[PDB]
Amino acid sequence: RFKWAIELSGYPVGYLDKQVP
Amino acid sequence: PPFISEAAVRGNAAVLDYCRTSVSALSGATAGILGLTGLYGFIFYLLASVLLSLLLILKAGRRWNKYFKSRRPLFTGGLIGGLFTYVLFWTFLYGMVHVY
Amino acid sequence: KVSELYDVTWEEMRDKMRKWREENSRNSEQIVEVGEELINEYASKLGDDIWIIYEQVMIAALDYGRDDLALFCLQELRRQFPGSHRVKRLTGMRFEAMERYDDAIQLYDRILQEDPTNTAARKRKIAIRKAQGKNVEAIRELNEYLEQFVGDQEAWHELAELYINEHDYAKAAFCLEELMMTNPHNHLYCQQYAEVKYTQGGLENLELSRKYFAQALKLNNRNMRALFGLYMSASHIASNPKASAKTKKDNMKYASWAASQINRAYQFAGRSKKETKYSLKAVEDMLETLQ
Amino acid sequence: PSLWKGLVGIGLFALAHAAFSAAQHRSYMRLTEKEDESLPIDIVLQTLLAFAVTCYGIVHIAGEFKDMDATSELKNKTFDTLRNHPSFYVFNHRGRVLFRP
């Protein structure tokens, strides 16, 4: 929550991204 | 239980079948040895069956719900082939002893 | 080892080796110690159980940097089974353990030519690719193999680990979902997926992480990692300045319950063994991170 | 432990002895041509005792039950043994250097 906090930032068969409600 | 493993239930079924077959064969052998005949001997078979079930309880003990859903398979499980083995061994030993 | 710091029969050693085989333990030193004695002093006692022990001891010795025993076991196995394919795989592994990769590659190509539907040769080629640091080629080859042979959970887990090592978390989460779908009763996969979702992104990712931490803790009540993750995720979501009041109070309640359970668990731990070093310390962690 | 095997063997031997005794008694009786149908009580007691002992002994060796809950044996599994993939082992690390470089 405070002080010590590390942020790490940086096609397997089916892979989609959007909608489809 | 939300999740069930088939291996455990199949192993339990195998153990029950082993016990039932062996006790049926032994009961048939001893009924043949005693020389009992007719429907009277049939009663003995039922008695033997009951005995088996009782011992199974002592094998299950408490918390039996972990191993089985209900005691009905533990009581009335496998009363068809056991009868055939019982009558076969009964005839075999009765012919071996009381005849001749 | 019998009458040497221990008093066990050969049956006990066999059972211990079998148990070490069932769960993939990689303590090579103890495995070699037990296996060499079992091979030497009890060879005739084991009727047909010595071949799998031969393979296991050879692998352990290769892992332990002791090649004489590996060569002995390989010679015995090759003599017993002429022309087998597992022995060729062991020979290839021995070749590649000495930094001779071209011979292993040609051996695996020969194996694949003899039998096209073999799996271990492709995995060993992928391992050879990984041993040289060529990460992208290994990932591509593993993806191709998974495309050909779906339903192999070891490959899915290895691909997930490789994606984790490359700081690409969406595809790792996808692979962990694929693994979790087949095994919904395993809490470790849920815990790891929750950790990946925690590390991935922001608010909704934290919500999913909290949900799956709760699910993992429900599956097994002894998982301390799941409890710590649940508490941390609830505290993180509660203090987020872009959340509604209802979610804020729900997360505060979740964090309070998690902290109470953690304190009770540490008291339980301190009751049995007397150290009293973390029960005095975990309370400070809970207090300083409150709200 | 292994005493149940001895118990069931003793029970089977006693049952066989009772069978032989009953057969011998029947063979002797058919010689004298006596229609009294005299079955000695001791033989019945012996065979019943042997049958009961044998069944009790054999009910204890069929095996042991196992819990049907799928999440029962994973309570002790740890992530140390779950991350090991035998098919993807690599022997390029510091273990070789530490032991006989």
Add this chain to the structure above:
Amino acid sequence: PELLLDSNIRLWVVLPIVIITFFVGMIRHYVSILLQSDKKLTQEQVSDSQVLIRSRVLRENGKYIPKQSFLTRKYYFNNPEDGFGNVTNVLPMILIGGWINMTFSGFVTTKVPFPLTLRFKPMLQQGIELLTLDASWVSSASWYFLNVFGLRSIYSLILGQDNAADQPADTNKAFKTEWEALELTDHQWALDDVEEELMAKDLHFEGMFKKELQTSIF
């Protein structure tokens, strides 16, 4: 009883039948294992079977993943993918029955201990030529068949599993069947109220800190 029998027939005709049928059954089981089958499958068959199993597992257990992933996989599998030996088992029984009838039939074997009717008589007395004899007395062939029929449980017990006794089609069709079956499945998340279920009671920290930490092997 009614008849007086020679003990020699009991010693030399009864036991050999049982021994022969027992060992014949064992030999039949072992021979059946010896040449059971040898099957080979091409890569496409196993790949398609694994794909079908994966689709079935998705349909069965999509309720343990986030709905977005479930529908992402459901967008897949719909547009791109789904649419783009005995002779020895039975004949030896009859052969051995005939051989036993040839070399053993002709005398009374034993008697069942329960009364029967006249319906049983034609079956249990194949070899004898009497007329008014009771149906309880059996011939040799009937005894052999009875012994054969009454050993299934014994074979299952003394031998592994059950043996030593008598008792895809089109890829496109399977693809269409799975496509039709999967189309009517909808996501139903099973983690909506997991937190409330967890919060009901304290955790089960009982029976976890027993025994002692392991020191070494064994």
